[PDB]
Amino acid sequence: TKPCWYWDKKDLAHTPSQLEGLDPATEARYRREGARFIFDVGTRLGLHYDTLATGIIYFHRFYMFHSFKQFPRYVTGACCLFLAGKVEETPKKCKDIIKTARSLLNDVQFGQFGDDPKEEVMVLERILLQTIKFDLQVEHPYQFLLKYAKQLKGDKNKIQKLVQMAWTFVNDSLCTTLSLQWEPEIIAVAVMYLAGRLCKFEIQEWTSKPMYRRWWEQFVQDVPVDVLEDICHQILDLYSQGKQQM
Amino acid sequence: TESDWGKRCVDKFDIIGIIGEGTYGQVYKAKDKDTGELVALKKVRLDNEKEGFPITAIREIKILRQLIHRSVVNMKEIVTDKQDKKDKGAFYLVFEYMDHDLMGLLESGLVHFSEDHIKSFMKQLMEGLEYCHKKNFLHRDIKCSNILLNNSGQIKLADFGLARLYNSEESRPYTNKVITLWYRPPELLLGEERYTPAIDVWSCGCILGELFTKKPIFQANLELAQLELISRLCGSPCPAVWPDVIKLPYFNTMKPKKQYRRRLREEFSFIPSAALDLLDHMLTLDPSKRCTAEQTLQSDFLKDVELSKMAPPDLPHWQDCH
Ligand SMILES: CN(C)C/C=C/C(=O)Nc1ccc(O[C@@H]2CCC[C@@H](Nc3ncc(Cl)c(-c4c[nH]c5ccccc45)n3)C2)cc1
Secondary structure, three states, X not given: OOOOOOOOOOHHHOOHHHHOOXXXXXXXXXXXXXXXXXXXXXXXXXXXXXXXXXXXXXXXXXXXXXXXXXXXXXXXXXXXXXXXXXXXXXXXXXHHHHHHHHOOOOHHHHOOOOOOHHHHHHHHHHHHXXXXXXXXXXXXXXXXXXXXXXXXXXXXXXXXHHHHXXXXXXXXXXXXXXXXXXXXXXXXXXXXXXXXXXXXXXXXXXXXXXOOOOHHHHOOOOOOHHHHHHHHHHHHHOOHHHOOOO | OOOOOOOOEHHHEEEEEEEEOOOOOOEEEEXXXXXXXXXXXXXXXXXXXXXXXXXXXXXXXXHHOOOOOOOEOOEEEEEEOOOOOXXXXXXXXXXXXXXXXXXXXXXXXXXXXXXXXXXXXXXXHHHHHHHHHHOOEEOOOOOHHHEEEOOOOOEEEOOOOOOEEOOOOOOOOOOOOOOOOOOOOHHHHOOOOOOOOHHXXXXXXXXXXXXXXXXXXXXXXXXXXXXXXXXXXXXXXXOOOOOOHHHOOOOOOOOOOOOOXXXXXXXXXXXXXXXXXXXXXHOOOOXXXXXXXXXXXXXXXXXXXXXXXXXXXXXXXXXXXX
8 A cells, every 4th residue: 555665774885876976975965955955945945844844855866766866956945845735735836836946055065957947857766656656645743843842831931932943853854864764743753852952942841741761752652761862862963064054 | 556557558558449539638449468358448648738647637636536437437447558758659548348238228218127127226326326425526527428338237427527515514615517507506506606415316316217218308408498398398397396496696687488387296206206206206396405425325216226136128239330
């Protein structure tokens, strides 16, 4: 019935790009440049959070079956954003996605689109739909971040600060392969656990079981704290090397 | 774990011939070379598409991959043309091949359904429809030509080109013109956009009335003349039976030539009483009192309908061409 869209940590080490020689460090950079390309091109076009994440999820899934050495990332990123716009009922014309892509990529980067950039994106729509197996519907951690945080009763300012900082962590988790690892429900819970530590907030003090430390077990089921520590470590790695400000 | 669509090629199907003009592309009849099961292929051409893969087809796929029911048409897989990038080719949607549709069997004049044929048919149509409404989906094209029936006696809803989600929590606006004029309820004729799933119950009410008459109950060409024919039978809309009829945009504009009285049980007395009860509850102008899909399954005309103990209809095996 439904395909499985999640890989182990070992499965994420033998991607088609790893087989064709590309090193993990460079592939990690190719996914950041691609995710942030889709994000920016969608932001300048007025697209919202559920559309940008869907395109970025198509991007991460696409390069689980194809190699970066065979498909330019910025070309695939534009084709993912073009499809997500039609899937999420906020379609943007193919001409507008190109006119915005050239205003963000330099001559070398835009050289990936070739002579007819639009035609190079239309053709890639065929293989993109086949690579994702026509599985268009995708949920994202944003919707769960809101619902989970809405059932919290307590300090208004503290809870609001917890949400907006976790909101940025979800914007960053799209730069990694976390979506390829865990369900969005676990990602939304993890970013809250991470935000709660950096803010020194007692999230259990805002629920129905203030004595129960594992406050999250009332939102998602069977997720040990070690799994949360893994997601937090991968998100904080983006903040290493001063790549971003907390 | 082979639920991966789009990879299998179309040459695994032997095309027998075209069976109709589809929305995106022609519809073909073919048999599977690996299982010998007769199927139908909905072609989706991509070359020379202003926006690439049609968004109307993307909606149908997003919905069909969520509707698993005996009465809802099921999409087996999606197959592609022959490839080998930088090539042109279309996609094909695969469905189980139904033998007949409703609009054809009644026009054929060669068929006539008894009371047990209609009970089992409406039974399956309502159960599958209740499954869609519970999933917060609205079919918006229910008609005779969109009700497929195989020679086994199993009914299936046909194509969801105009289907959409429905926010049951808070009412939000939707698209007005959706259904063919013959099956369109009044609230849509008067310009309602925050309509409920009740627009399908009305179209299904005309299917039940059409099985006992072999001809559509309402046949008009313009929305105003359509409202004229509906009022002549169901009565004229007015706040006495519909407190919110005053709120509709075209209410005062599209006034019937007279203030008619409901004579439905008069013109449809040859129908059994239990069927007339369900027909009356399905053709009530006010959608707030129009029975839901679940309430039709609880009626006397369908509550004790046992599908297992049903005899197959006298359906012709000689499809009229090929
Ligand atoms: C005399 N006369 C008039 C002349 C001869 C003409 C003619 O008729 N030919 C032909 C026709 C038709 C056909 O067919 C049949 C009918 C009924 C139903 C069916 N079933 C079915 N199954 C499956 C499916 Cl998928 C389906 C669908 C869905 N949709 C669509 C759309 C379009 C098309 C399709 C379709 N369906 C069968 C076949 C053949």
